[model samples]
Target: DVASDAKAAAELVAANAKAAAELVAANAKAAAEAVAR
Candidate 1:
């Protein structure tokens, strides 16, 4: 049913959220280093 597929997609979205947060943090760290130079 459509609900099952939606549930799986929701799980994937949660995982992606964590991955996106890591990337955001990495970008911020890089920006800080650039400023310190």
Candidate 2:
């Protein structure tokens, strides 16, 4: 059903968004360290 699909997709989307944000933050920290040196 469409409702079931949306329910699963929303959880997946939340996880993906959290991970992507963490990835970007790590990358930025490393990048900034290079600039600082």
Candidate 3:
């Protein structure tokens, strides 16, 4: 009923997607603030 590896198939479903979402942004903001002070 599913692909050879349904779990792994999910990985291919999204490539270079908005994978970063807000994670990288949040880190950048924190990094700037840390050195900004």
Candidate 4:
């Protein structure tokens, strides 16, 4: 039971990190443009 819970938690963590990375990437161009301006 403990192992199963740990596995689920790890998956959630990975998913959250992936989503954050995507969000940052999506905004990266806008951020750069604002800085340039």
Question: TM-score per candidate, in order?
Answer: 0.71, 0.65, 0.45, 0.60
Poorest 10 consecutive residues by lDDT, candidate 3 = 13-22
| Candidate 2, residue 2: lDDT | 89
Candidate 3 lDDT over 1-37, as tens digits, reads 3875886677765543555656678878999999997
RMSD of 4: 1.8
Runs in model 3 lying further than 4 Å from the true structure: 1-19
User: Mind giving the per-residue lDDT tens digits that candidate 4 earns over 1-37?
Assistant: 8899999999999999999899898789779989998
Model 4 Cα shift for residue 1 (angstroms): 3.4
Ranking by TM-score: 1, 2, 4, 3
lDDT of 1: 0.93
Misplaced by over 4 Å in model 2 are none
- Which scores better on TM-score, 1 or 3? 1
Error of 4 at 37 (Å): 6.7
Pairwise lDDT winner, candidates 1 and 3: 1
Candidate 2 structure quality by residue, lDDT tens digits, 1-37: 7899999899899999999999999989989998998
In the order shown, the candidates' Cα RMSDs to the true structure are 1.3, 1.7, 4.1, 1.8
**Best lDDT goes to which candidate?**
2
lDDT of each prediction vs. the true structure? 0.93, 0.94, 0.71, 0.92
> Residue 35 of candidate 3: its Cα lDDT?
95
Clashes of 1: 0
